[PDB]
Design a protein around this nucleic acid. Structure first.
Ligand SMILES: [Br-]
Ligand SMILES: [Zn+2]
Ligand SMILES: [Zn+2]
Ligand SMILES: [Zn+2]
Ligand SMILES: [Zn+2]
Lengths: 79, 73
DNA sequence: TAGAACAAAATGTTCT
DNA sequence: AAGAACATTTTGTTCT
């Protein structure tokens, strides 16, 4: 267990509840805090991996949610 | 009137094709620079004004296929 | 019409 | 672990 669950690159730790690399960490934070009105140019199942994760922010963010990322994971594991 | 690659607003005829300024500039960069664009779908993404930034592989392919060529005039 | 430059958006890394 | 600040990459506009 040492892979990012969103893009399958090398995980750098748990962030927002999920083992992810640092790039998905800050992507998710930015997506959750701001606008994430993204539009898939395919069929909403683009392949999110180390080279292609730049391609589709819409599917990357759905992959984050699917993997379970959530901003209040910190205060969550406190319960 | 409208870009042949991404359906944005065509600014004129660039490298052989009626394209927009985004696509014009994207095209030169694609062929001159070196990157390896890989499609994350099915090699058939939708390239419109918003989605053109998502898949440079498909955008680039659309460019070539629409006849864009650095050598034209 | 093409380039250059400039500017902005989107992604990723370091935190001596 | 979470997040700021820094840094890069990628895209788009404008002014030659
Ligand atoms: Br920078
Ligand atoms: Zn990742
Ligand atoms: Zn997608
Ligand atoms: Zn275009
Ligand atoms: Zn594509």
């Amino acid at each position: 267990s040492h892979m990012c669950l969103v893009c399958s690159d090398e995980a750098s730790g748990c962030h927002y509840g999920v083992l992810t690399c640092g790039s998905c960490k800050v992507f998710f934070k930015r997506a959750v805090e701001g606008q994430h009105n993204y539009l898939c140019a395919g069929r909403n199942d683009c392949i999110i991996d180390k080279i292609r994760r730049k391609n589709c922010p819409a599917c990357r963010y759905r992959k984050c949610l699917q993997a379970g990322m959530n901003l209040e994971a910190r205060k969550t594991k406190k319960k």
